[PDB]
Design an enzyme around this catalytic site. Structure first.
Site, PDB file in Angstrom:
ATOM      1  N   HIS A  53    -160.225  28.942  -8.401  1.00 43.41           N
ATOM      2  CA  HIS A  53    -160.961  27.926  -9.187  1.00 43.41           C
ATOM      3  C   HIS A  53    -160.097  27.130 -10.159  1.00 43.41           C
ATOM      4  O   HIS A  53    -159.564  28.036 -11.226  1.00 43.41           O
ATOM      5  CB  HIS A  53    -162.222  28.530  -9.994  1.00 43.41           C
ATOM      6  CG  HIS A  53    -163.134  27.890 -10.772  1.00 43.41           C
ATOM      7  ND1 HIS A  53    -162.692  27.539 -12.013  1.00 43.41           N
ATOM      8  CD2 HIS A  53    -164.060  26.929 -10.601  1.00 43.41           C
ATOM      9  CE1 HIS A  53    -163.722  26.614 -12.481  1.00 43.41           C
ATOM     10  NE2 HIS A  53    -164.633  26.314 -11.522  1.00 43.41           N
ATOM     11  N   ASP A  69    -169.088  26.684 -14.829  1.00 47.98           N
ATOM     12  CA  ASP A  69    -168.874  25.631 -13.785  1.00 47.98           C
ATOM     13  C   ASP A  69    -169.174  26.321 -12.276  1.00 47.98           C
ATOM     14  O   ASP A  69    -169.536  25.556 -11.360  1.00 47.98           O
ATOM     15  CB  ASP A  69    -167.489  25.095 -14.022  1.00 47.98           C
ATOM     16  CG  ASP A  69    -167.316  23.962 -12.768  1.00 47.98           C
ATOM     17  OD1 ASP A  69    -168.104  23.047 -12.681  1.00 47.98           O
ATOM     18  OD2 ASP A  69    -166.185  24.231 -12.138  1.00 47.98           O
TER      19      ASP A  69
END
Ligand code: PP9
Ligand code: PP9
Ligand code: PP9
Ligand code: CHD
Ligand code: FES
Ligand code: FES
Lengths: 359, 359
Positions: free
Chosen positions: B166, B319
């Site tokens: 990520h 997120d």
């Protein structure tokens, strides 16, 4: 026009005819840099002889020998063509094959490059991911060539020692992976599991800090991101040799375990190779995709094809070499660091051979 | 208000106080999903009793317990504050700590999640890199909870079972590594070797096809690509326990090995943890950095700081959650495929209690 820049392509190489099996195996098993063995000098010959027979048969099953040389040539020529364009300054480029255990040897190639009056020599490993067992052995070879004779090169040396994630290498695998998936029964595609099968390594090498596993993983990671996780994948290791412990799930046991657990649509990927040879044409294609696939009851087991003549791969070779020159770097930053638990005196010296270089 | 969407954070947990060490070790060495031991039920107790003194001492040396809950708590609140805003439709968000071996046990957390009458239940693993021994075990607990309570969940479940590359996770490590480099002499900065030290795994788990190894590597690559190979690096592994074979080069041997070979400027990096605990504060900080580097005779051996309270980390959490909720995914493609040589009946079942979810 006199050859100005020489690109020495390094790979292991393989028996062209069945008559070359024994000598190939003897050199291979004698190489302490590939893998360490008790009394290698005496065990190797023993191993070479006992092993020659079945290997010869394997080579017969796929043509009578390895295609590695033919594939390596096609790749280089395409490379040269593009180099002779991307970098007009480096005048004519000439590719050179430096196989570790088969004449065209690394030593015959160096001798040959020197005889061409090249002003630039680039050691370009054909092993995208770095292992002290592969690129490290080819490199030490270069270093030793000069060491033994006791003379300094008449050319400037530099080295592209690795290229795990070159975006063009990645695109080649992804692409090859998409035309394979396209040939599985349409309703079974999203069920196909992608098995990246990298050559395995003795745990004696892995446990000494070898760079290999991590970079193969990196190659694996880029490809899957490129394919945006369209299918489940797993990284497995093939071609183990001998009794000693080797790394991660073996490919054979993985194809078997998957098959027995419901996953009968498998796509194999030669993630650490650049061309077809015994490892794909016989091991993956015959041993697993035919015999093992049959014994376990596979619905579909297919293999993404080898880079081989893919122009995009040639594009990649040249681009790497081009960037290499532009960068004026003597080697990768990673090379400047030997294995944490390295015990090979040659390593540290081979490192100087490229880092302690001019121009 | 009242929770609408619940984010269940999963991690191993740790002994808050010296008094909690013994039973913490008993639970851990009994969990067969973590690692398999001969006569487990007999051996675990022995091991726990004998290992407690040493481990209480270690906690004493770092505060008298582990930070993991405090840290996890702060990261969760930060995630919440963001989620209640980035995704208002998902209304109030509540984070629950789901520790595998200590209180807010995965079960207790599920319990109060159900009780808080949630609508959506998300299993958010705090293990960026998936291993059956970690996320795998935590997920198995969620499954075994309902199956043992004999009742169907009163909320939609989904899972974020892994997030190895990520973008924001990579930015925290890359960043922390940079400011750590700044504390090194300037004419050494680039000579510093970066050792990404992940938690090791037993070969028994690695050879079964565990995702962890390849996944951890993928993180390393991203970090280095972002740091555009400013320094030499190697992925090594820490924390092996017991007589059995464990993965790759040990962090300790790698450190001492670098000293003896000259590289005496080292930067350690907790590439698999998301906060500080005994694996960093004691093992890396006191056992290697202090004691080991002492003898070794090292220049500067520092460690990038753990993610901990880094705001960017909360953003990463937020997120991921938000992105998860939009994708309407139940889990990753990777989770839909168990290990090639998997022999755990629970696995298959856990994969169902996620892939068979509403909305
Ligand atoms: C130290 C661990 C390794 C050992 C012991 C090893 C052994 C071999 N490698 C061989 C061929 C080969 N190995 C090869 C690439 C690799 N080989 C690798 C690592 C090893 N390769 C790695 C890593 C490679 C790159 C990813 C290639 C290309 C051949 C030649 C294939 C051909 O041309 O037929 C052969 C001949 C085959 C046989 O079964 O007799 C052996 C014995
Ligand atoms: C079969 C493989 C594993 C074993 C046997 C294992 C064992 C342990 N893990 C512990 C704590 C821990 N392990 C932890 C994360 C991991 N642990 C992992 C894999 C294993 N962890 C992996 C993989 C992790 C994540 C990448 C954490 C976070 C703790 C908690 C430390 C604390 O809070 O103080 C402890 C208690 C510490 C000690 O040294 O006595 C043991 C015994
Ligand atoms: C992997 C399977 C394991 C086997 C076959 C095993 C075998 C043994 N473990 C022993 C002792 C021990 N094992 C011990 C911790 C562990 N042992 C473990 C796993 C095993 N331990 C694990 C995991 C441990 C957690 C760290 C401890 C603490 C002792 C105590 C040794 C002593 O000082 O007497 C002894 C006897 C030592 C002696 O001299 O009396 C044996 C034969
Ligand atoms: C690994 C563990 C130490 C606990 C720890 O990690 O701190 C040690 C303590 C006792 C050791 C064992 C004992 O010395 C008994 C055996 C001695 C043999 O030479 C090797 C295996 C043998 C079975 C040992 C395996 C391992 O080294 C043990 C189990
Ligand atoms: S064995 Fe890797 S540098 Fe020597
Ligand atoms: S141990 Fe990995 S799916 Fe079962």
């Amino acid at each position: 026009r006199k050859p100005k820049t020489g690109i020495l392509m390094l790979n292991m190489g393989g028996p062209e005819t069945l008559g070359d099996v024994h000598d190939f195996l003897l050199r291979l098993f004698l190489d302490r840099d590939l893998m360490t063995l008790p009394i290698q000098n005496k065990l190797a010959p023993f191993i070479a002889k006992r092993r020659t027979p079945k290997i010869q048969e394997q080579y017969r099953r796929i043509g009578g020998g390895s295609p590695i040389k033919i594939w390596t040539s096609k790749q280089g020529e395409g490379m040269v063509k593009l180099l002779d364009e991307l970098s007009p300054n480096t005048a004519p480029h000439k590719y050179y094959i430096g196989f570790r255990y088969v004449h065209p040897l690394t030593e015959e190639a160096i001798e040959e490059m020197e005889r061409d009056g090249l002003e630039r020599a680039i050691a370009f490993t054909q092993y995208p991911q770095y292992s002290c067992s592969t690129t490290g052995s080819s490199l030490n070879a270069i270093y030793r060539y000069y060491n033994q004779v006791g003379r300094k090169p008449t050319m400037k040396w530099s080295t592209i020692d690795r290229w795990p994630t070159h975006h063009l290498l990645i695109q080649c695998f992804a692409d090859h992976i998409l035309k394979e998936l396209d040939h599985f029964p349409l309703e079974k595609r999203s069920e196909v599991v992608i098995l990246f099968s990298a050559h395995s390594l003795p745990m004696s090498v892995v446990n000494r800090g070898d760079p290999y596993p991590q970079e193969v993983s990196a190659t694996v990671q880029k490809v899957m991101e490129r394919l945006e996780y369209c299918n489940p994948y797993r990284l497995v290791w093939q071609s183990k040799v001998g009794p000693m412990p080797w790394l991660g799930p073996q490919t054979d046991e993985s194809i078997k375990g998957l098959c027995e657990r419901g996953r009968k649509n498998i796509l194999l990927v030669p993630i650490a190779f650049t061309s077809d040879h015994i490892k794909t044409l016989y091991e993956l294609d015959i041993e697993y995709s035919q015999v093992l696939a049959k014994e376990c009851g596979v619905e579909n087991i297919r293999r993404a094809e080898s880079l081989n003549g893919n122009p995009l791969f040639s594009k990649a070779l040249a681009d790497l070499v081009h960037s290499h020159i532009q960068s004026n770097e003597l080697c990768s930053k990673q090379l400047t660091l030997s294995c944490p638990l390295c015990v090979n005196p040659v390593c540290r010296e081979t490192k100087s051979f490229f880092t302690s270089q001019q121009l």
